[PDB]
Amino acid sequence: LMIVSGRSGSGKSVALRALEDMGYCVDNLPVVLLPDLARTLADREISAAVSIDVRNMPESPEIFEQAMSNLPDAFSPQLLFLDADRNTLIRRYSDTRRLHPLSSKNLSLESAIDKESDLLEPLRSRADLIVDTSEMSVHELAEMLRTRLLGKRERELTMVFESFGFKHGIPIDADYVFDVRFLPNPHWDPKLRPMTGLDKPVAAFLDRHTEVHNFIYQTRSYLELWLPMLETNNRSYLTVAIGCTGGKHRSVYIAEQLADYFRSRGKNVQSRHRTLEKR
């Protein structure tokens, strides 16, 4: 069961028209009637498409989650939330229509949008997948809806940090590559040179140098930032290639600490120290 909700003007309509091709485009139903409708569609035995908005929102989400309670299990619900900025929102809604709540309330075109946002927010908090429509025009919005809605693997997006070395060339599975050369070479110490990347003494040497911390952290800020956008798309293995030349001292420790951090954030992480692998 597909759920298409969001601030008006964010383009629910075009999504529906494309949702009918994906599936059961049906709109403007009191959510209460939904579960029985699902009972009916069980005969249809084909995925569905239900649209809810400020006009179709009963302004009492207790009822909403009540309808969520008696949900036939045949269809698994997913909250798809279109959203965008106020100004654009007004622009598009300037298309011939009439914001229903604004009747009687007479909120300024900007003021009802403000009202509606919070109004529907209950769902939005529980909204499963979000998509901006900040600036995609209706024709641009049509192709963008087609690419993501087809989520075949709605399972996870595994991280995998591959620690490599340059002398044996960039790993072919690399999606990103962050050199690390200019960091303080542990080589300087002859004692540490035989010791491998995982051996605590080198971890100490690296720990001694704060610059290392600065790099890890700033790199954690760089990814996390550009991350969620990626996580939405239908990827199966996002990877980050980290490499000194040696691929035995620096890149080891880096990839290790990063893996730790992101595991902390709960994204499953896979370590791979290409050179240390038995090949």
Q: Taking the complex as a whole, how short is the minimal distance between the CB of residue 7 and RNA, in angstroms? A: 24
Q: Phi/psi class of residue 212: alpha, beta or left (left: φ > 0; alpha: ψ in -120 to 50)? A: alpha
- What's the closest the beta carbon of residue 156 comes to RNA, in angstroms? 12
Instruction: Give the residue from 249, 241, 246 showing the smallest Cα distance to 272.
Output: 241
- In one-letter notation, the amino acid at residue 175 is D
Is residue 136 within the footprint of RNA (CB under 7 A)? Answer: no
Is residue 233 part of the contact set for RNA (CB under 7 A)? yes
Q: What string marks each residue from 43 to 62 as x (binds a copy of itself by CB under 8 A) or -?
A: ------------x-------
244-263 binders of RNA (CB under 7 A): 244-249
Binding at 91: pick from RNA, a copy of itself, none (beta carbon under 5-8 Å per type): a copy of itself
Residue 272 burial (CB count, 10 A): 17
Q: Which does 246 bind (CB under 5 to 8 A by kind): a copy of itself, RNA, none?
A: RNA
CA distances from 197 to 100, 246, 255 (A): 64, 10, 10
Considering only residues 27, 68, 72, 271, which one is a binding residue for a copy of itself as defined by CB under 8 A?
27
Measured CA to CA, the distance from residue 61 to residue 119 in angstroms comes to 9
How far apart, in whole angstroms, are the C-alpha atoms of residue 86 and residue 217?
A: 34
**Closer CB to a copy of itself, residue 184 or residue 201?**
184
User: Which stretch in 33-41, 86-94, 129-137, 186-194 sits in contact with RNA by CB under 7 A?
Assistant: 186-194
- Using alpha carbons, list the distances in angstroms from residue 239 to 113, 170, 208, 227: 40, 13, 28, 11
Binding-site members are 6-13, 53-56
Residues annotated in the binding site for GTP, as ranges? 53-56
